[PDB]
Structures are given as C-alpha cells and as structure tokens.
Design a protein around this ligand. Structure first.
Ligand SMILES: Nc1c2c(nc3c1CCC3)CCCC2
Ligand SMILES: Nc1c2c(nc3c1CCC3)CCCC2
Ligand SMILES: [Cl-]
Ligand SMILES: [Cl-]
Lengths: 306, 306
C-alpha cells in the first residue's frame, strides 16, 4: 500500500544524454543510434532569441561547430539537419547504449517522466503531465533545454517531450522528438501566454480510485450523478468535460473497487462544491490530476520493466 | 524555474538490483561487489512471520537454497551470513556494474530516493523522507521488500534504506544496509504502531524559501518571531522544535533571498494559525516537509551527477 508520484526508472535514458555546445550556448542532446537530437535554439545567442531566423542562422554553422560530448569523450559530427524545431546531428558512432525506443506525440492529459539534465549530466527525475493548455509544469533552469520526457513499456522507451522554453509565468513548453511544439508555442522570446489550466477530470477520478484502494475513503458518499449533470459542475470549476470514452477507460478501476464511475463522479462533485474541509486524500489537500488511469493500475499492481 | 519533488537518477542502482528466492518467497536483493544484501525474512513463510526465530530458521538453509538471479542469469552463492535483520549472500562474481558507494544511516528529517522493485526489476522511482517517528511513507506492494533507498553525491551512491515491513496503518518500516531497523520496528508480524507523525519544521522552511525563489510570495508578511515564540506554535501543531542548528543550516537560503530565517518562521507561524485560505504554494495546498535545505539549494542551482 501507499501511493506516490512515481517516475520511470531513468537508467535507459541516462545512457542517451550528451552535451551539445554551439558557440557560447550549451544544452543537452539525446543520442539514439547515430543521431543526436537537440533544440535548434542551440544556434542562437540570447540576442537572437527575440526574433531568430533559424534557416539563416544555420547557414553559418558547419558540422565542426557542433561540439557533442558523451561523458568525457567527444563524438564526431558527420552531418546535420533541421527538422521543425530540433536539430539532428549525425555522428560517426552509434550509441552503444541505445535502448529499444519509439517517438510518440502524446495527447493532453497523458503523463510522462522527465530526466532533468545540465551539461549532458542527469540531475534528477520527476513525473509530469501534458496540460490541457499544452504546457507542462516542470523544474527547469538555464541549461536544462534538451532534457527529455518519456514513458517505458517493459523494455521500450517512448520519447514524447523535449524541453525548449520557459514562459514568463514559469510554466514550460517543448516539442515532440520530431521537433513539433505541443500547443501554439514557438522558440522565440516573445509575448506568448498559456491559456486556462483546466483540470484533467479523468485523472482526478483515477486518483480517487487509488485513494479507495489504499484505504482513504472518507469522501465516498450516498449519491450518484450523470455525465451531463457532472459536466455542469466540471464547467464551473474549469474541469475537462467527462466523456463516455473516459468512463470506459475507468472501467477496470470501477470493477476492482466495485464503485460505479458515476458514483465516484458524485463524490468528486461534492468535493468540488464543498472543499476538503481541511482533510487530505493520499496526503494531498487538493485534487491530484497527474495520475492517469493506466498509472493507477500500474502502481497498484506493481508492473515492472527490463 | 518551477520546483518539483525530484528523485535521483536511478541508473546506478538499477544496475545493482537482483531477485532473491528462498523456498516459496521471492523479493529483491542489492548486488554490490560479490555480496547480495536482502531482508532476512526471505527465509520465512507467512506463518513464520507471527513469531520467527531467525537463527533457528536459518539452520535449515544452505547456500544452494538461495536462488539469486540477475536479469536472466543465475548467480552462484558461495556463502551466507545474517547481520542484524539482513542477509549477506556471497556470490562468486563481482557485480560488474557496482558503482562507487557507501552505507549511511540517516537521521529523521533526511530525504532519499527509493527505486521500487518487484522480482529484481525496477518499477519506478520516488522521493521519501525518514519521518520523525522513523517510518517512511512509501509505495510498496507484496514483493517490493529489498527495494532500497539512496542518495547520490556526484558519482557515489550512499545507500541508507532497505524495505522490510508495512504496518497496519499503511506506512513503512525498514533497515539501513547494516540490517538495523530505523526506529523501534521489528521484522515480525505483530502489534507495533507508529508514534506521532510530526512535521519536519526545517524542511517546511526550506520549501518556503524554494517558493519565494520561484515567485510564490503571497505568504510573506510584516512580522518576525523568536525561536522560543515560534516553538510554542510548533508544539501546538506537532511540528519539530526549531533549533539554532536548523537556523544555521538555512543560512545560505536566507542569504540568497534576503529573508531572515526568523522572518520566514513568522510567515510559517501565520500559515499554521490561519491556514492557506484556499491558496496554494508551489502547487500544494498543505505545507510540504520532504524537501531538505540541501535539496532546495541543489534543485534551485542545478547540481548534476556522473
Ligand atoms: N477555516 C479554517 C480556519 C483555520 N485553519 C484552516 C481552516 C480550513 C482548513 C485550515 C484557522 C483559523 C480559523 C479558521
Ligand atoms: N470555506 C470553503 C468553502 C468551500 N470551499 C472551500 C472553502 C475553503 C477552501 C475550499 C465551498 C463551500 C463554502 C465554503
Ligand atoms: Cl509510474
Ligand atoms: Cl534531488
């Protein structure tokens, strides 16, 4: 028992982290096979970042201007190209530690682990979600760009995020490993503001199932609701609309606990309307929304990875 | 910016995890050099656990009864001995992935990372603290025993915890790597209950410094206090007494922010007396106590590890 915000084991990704320097800018790269992936803004100065013309800036760069170091050992760059907002640096040596992997573009509401790095070196690991406004709420300092987000299925690392930008409000924006930003964000230092940070309703319900499984049950009540009634309340509290697809995804947790999904929605409705009254659920005083239903099942059944 | 509950990169420890089976019991072991460390209750049946005589139970075990598997490959056990509440299984092959390491016995209030494992395989990683009642609040299911807790300093893993027991209240008890339990707990299935879970006051203050550094500042007020006055309030709220040693440890965060430690105590005092009034700090609705002052500095300055 117990239920904790848990990241994937980071070792397979640690093995892929390198340092990339272009001019006076150093950040991180991801070394898979004979390709190192990194944010294209490695080519920019700070001045450049207000209005960068990436194609033009790249003309002045040759393979030997990209300094790629794996631990203490330099890699030889034999080619480079820009794909969307990432650079792909071809190197002459395949990473011997390349795991099985995929590139995935995740949907808002999905969770993933981030291996925060500086100068190619791992600092720590934590769990994140892709917010409904396509930001993430991370922990990133200058030099952390190129840190990546990932999920693991047994032995296969699915990379889904690469860190590029901090907005003025202190939330974070980045790309998938094809170099496409999540949401409307761009790699320029400009006025771009995040929209409404809505709560991931299906994730809160999953976490309330997690609480029940772990003995925290004070919030179960005598009521039920419907999708349409519940969603009048979700709207008022900036919660995502609950859909029948969400209901179906919560089926296994419903079966395990014997609590109908709509009954748990009625618990959630009362918690939204009444507050926690100074009580806690799984050691939180607010409703946690960065556990997916798959996360809950995984943690509550003990799934492992090679 | 941003501030997250962050674990150490788990790779160096992943490399040390093995599976240990004795009879019909399987749990995890830690393979360092030519020794595999595991909870001595691997020798017990469930029946045994109400009143085990470990010395007597061990007489019936030989080296070949301890099945140790590292991934897909079996290790040969050439000796075994009991030290306190752990077994040390000597194997014929030094772990080729042994990191630089130490065994440390931590003090209450110190934090560490746990690599949760089942059948020798990593499941996930999360951050914990040694509570003032010598429990930890973990995420552990049947089969997770032998999972370990650790800190990393550059390239050296300091192992501090090995998981042994769940209490009936759903909190967790374990040993250092010399096999001595933290607190009063024993490896028997009995009536043993945790004491008061007091809040780690120095850690809350560190986290309030973290909040300020990250722009969350609504709780700074016009007041100050003294240690003795503050501690009348800590006592009322089951907070650890603040000491001059605690004040000294918070010195660097005080210097960085320009907020005197006692002024921040006066902020904390008002938060304890008044509540959060429905507000949040670093995305929490309660006062977080599982970040040390060293953790805050580390995360706020971007320290890394080889
Ligand atoms: N209504 C309160 C009050 C206090 N503290 C808290 C709540 C809600 C949960 C924390 C302390 C002062 C009186 C009212
Ligand atoms: N006093 C309240 C009330 C509500 N919800 C909350 C608090 C504290 C923070 C959450 C909703 C109902 C009225 C009072
Ligand atoms: Cl997980
Ligand atoms: Cl840390």
């Amino acid at each position: 028992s117990g239920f904790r915000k848990m990241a994937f084991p980071s070792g397979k990704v640690e093995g892929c982290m390198v340092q990339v320097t272009c001019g006076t800018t150093t950040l991180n790269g991801l070394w898979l096979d004979d390709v190192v992936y990194c944010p294209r803004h490695v080519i920019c100065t700070s001045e450049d970042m207000l209005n960068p013309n990436y194609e033009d800036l790249l003309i002045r760069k040759s393979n030997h201007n990209f300094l790629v170091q794996a631990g203490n050992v330099q890699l030889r760059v034999i080619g480079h190209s820009m794909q969307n907002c990432v650079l792909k640096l071809k190197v002459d040596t395949a990473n011997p530690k390349t795991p099985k992997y995929k590139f995935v573009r995740i949907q808002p509401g999905q969770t993933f682990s981030v291996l925060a790095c500086y100068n190619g070196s791992p600092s720590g690991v934590y769990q994140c979600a892709m917010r409904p406004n396509f930001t993430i709420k991370g922990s990133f300092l200058n030099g952390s760009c190129g840190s990546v987000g990932f999920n693991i299925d047994y032995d296969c690392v699915s990379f889904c995020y690469m860190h590029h930008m901090e907005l003025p409000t202190g939330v974070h924006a980045g790309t998938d490993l094809e170099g496409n930003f999540y949401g409307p964000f761009v790699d320029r230092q400009t006025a771009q503001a995040a929209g409404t940070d809505t709560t991931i309703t299906v994730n809160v319900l999953a976490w309330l199932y997690a609480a029940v499984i772990n003995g925290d049950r004070w919030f179960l009540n005598r009521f039920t609701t419907t999708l349409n009634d519940f969603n009048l309340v979700a709207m008022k509290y900036n919660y995502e609309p609950l859909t029948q697809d969400h209901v179906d995804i919560l089926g296994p947790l419903s079966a395990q606990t014997g609590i109908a999904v709509l009954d748990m929605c009625a618990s959630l409705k009362e918690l939204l309307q009444n507050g926690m009254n100074g009580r806690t659920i799984l050691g939180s005083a607010l409703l946690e929304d960065e556990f997916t239903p798959f996360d809950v099942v995984r943690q509550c059944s003990g799934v492992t990875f090679q």
